[PDB]
């Protein structure tokens with residue numbers, strides 16, 4: 001717990017070092033790319049077939065995959081869900097995105113259950129919890145970048161995300177990638 005909080009603090013103290021320039025939009029868009037890269041890893045492993053990337057009307061971004069779902073069982077050493085360990089302990093890792101997010105929402109569908117957890121600046125608000133039943137599997141991460149970290153360029157650029165997602169669809173030809181902008185209704189579907 002003290003180690004977790006110190007590691008998150010290490011990322012916040014030197015955020016450009018972990019995520020890229022925090023003033024010119026590079027780091028901001030790399031936050032999305034890190035989350036997408038985890039979904040792509042789940043596609044490379046043979047589990048994920050579709051990835052949905054949403055720019056919400058409030059300039060948060062979500063990434064949904066249909067992979068296995070991050071494991072949810074208690075990780076013995078930490079006494080918290082494996083998912084929480086992945087989200088909070090230091091491809092820079094999704095924990096960097098969590099550390100640099102004012103808020104992050106995690107929803108996992110796995111082993112017949114839906115699980116949800118909220119973080120603020122990487123601090124879990126409650127233990128991962130069951131919210132219902134599902135026959136689906138996958139992982140959804142929605143994050144609200146911290147305005148204490150990201151300056152000047154704070155709004156996501158549809159075209160920057162679209163170009164990278166098109167590249168990833170070409171390089172992962174089986175994967176379907178959807179991009180949706182809730183700010184204006186724009187959407188794209190990349191599937192080689």
Ligand SMILES: Cc1[nH]c(C(=O)Nc2nc3cc(O)c(C(=O)O)cc3s2)c(Cl)c1Cl
Nearest residue numbers: 035038039042067068069070071094139141
């Ligand atoms: C959008 C997004 N998706 C992910 C993701 O699917 N990561 C996952 N990691 C693991 C690790 C595992 O050991 C297992 C298992 O053994 O079944 C399953 C998964 S799924 C992450 Cl992380 C993020 Cl971020």
